[PDB]
Amino acid sequence: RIENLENAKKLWDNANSMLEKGNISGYLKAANELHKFMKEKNLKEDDLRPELSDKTISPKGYAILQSLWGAASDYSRAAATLTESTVEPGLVSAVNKMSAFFMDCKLSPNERATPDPDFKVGKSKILVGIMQFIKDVADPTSKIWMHNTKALMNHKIAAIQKLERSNNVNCETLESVLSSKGENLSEYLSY
Amino acid sequence: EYDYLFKLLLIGDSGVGKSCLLLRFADDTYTESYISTIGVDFKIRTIELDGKTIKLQIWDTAGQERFRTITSSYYXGAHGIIVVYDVTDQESYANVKQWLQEIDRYASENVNKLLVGNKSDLTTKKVVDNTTAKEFADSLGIPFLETSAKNATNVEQAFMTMAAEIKKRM
Ligand SMILES: Nc1nc2c(ncn2[C@@H]2O[C@H](COP(=O)(O)OP(=O)(O)O)[C@@H](O)[C@H]2O)c(=O)[nH]1
């Protein structure tokens, strides 16, 4: 157990270090690694938190986690539609829990985050980062409704990027992308 | 199938009893390996109300305890929000009061709201007077209820009232 915890400690540092550099996808993957390892080794937040006494999440990190939290929470619910309400909300919601798990390894219950205002990530930038991560961890056979998940994420990433280029990013236009299940495409997507 | 799909938020600090409130709700399982390792933020339940079937999808957003500056995350994209305080803890009541005041400002009228004092069965340890919470809820035009999640008292009625006030709006 002693060395499993120290390997979890370094995996946590790796995610925190990824956070200190604004590497979103890299933070998410490192948090994924940490989570998978603790689940395999049967470690819980309580076990590792004492070992993190001397480590800390910066105001910059808390800023990126808050942006990630806000965007993922809105996306999880917008993606719940009459077409389908489990897989896409599940994927986005699981990203959120993965980031909450990183913080719970470090923080006592109900300890507030102290985010730095000037390091806020704009919601359109986080959303692509979330979709890029989902694209990368989704099973190759994963599907959202009738579409392959990876392929639908690419389509949504491109949709958001098109909105940014034409300077047409608002909650209405973003909600359309997040709620879409590609019903008006000409193919069920695939490899 | 169902006739309606309502989206609910469950707001409240850790320890107040959000998980216990959702005991009647179920978790979606996933053939996705990434999901099965982690899990999700929401639970689902189909109910019958006035001869209509309603799917309730309720978010107990992970990490919310960390970010209590009240943004749209708390008041857009939801048909209902359920705000929960611990009846045996004044600081949790003072917190939801603050947040529920801020939600009330920005929130559209169409979003329905319910204040819940939980752990009413801890009557020896009970610190928050319901007439105080009741009058705070009245001041904002919001329903108020005390519950025991453990005993499951007023939990069903909390969701059924909330579901009924959304359904009448739409
Ligand atoms: N006595 C009593 N305890 C409760 C009630 N609801 C929750 N709890 C207790 O409060 C603690 C945390 O509740 P939990 O479901 O984990 O709330 P959450 O952590 O905020 O999701 C647990 O020890 C529960 O047993 C209740 O209605 N009565």
Side-chain angles (χ1 to χ4, degrees), chain A residues 102-131:
Chain A
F102 171 82
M103 292 180 73
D104 295 339
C105 286
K106 179 66 183 87
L107 287 184
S108 169
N110 295 323
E111 211 184 327
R112 307 312 189 200
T114 31
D116 181 346
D118 44 51
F119 270 144
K120 60 179 297 179
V121 197
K123 190 167 141 177
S124 293
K125 295 74 139 143
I126 298 99
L127 292 167
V128 313
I130 292 166
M131 293 174 299

Side-chain angles (χ1 to χ4, degrees), chain B residues 13-20 60 118-119 121-122 148-150:
Chain B
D13 268 353
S14 302
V16 302
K18 295 175 294 298
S19 304
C20 192
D60 167 4
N118 192 47
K119 312 203 188 161
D121 59 291
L122 293 183
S148 172
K150 286 192 76 156

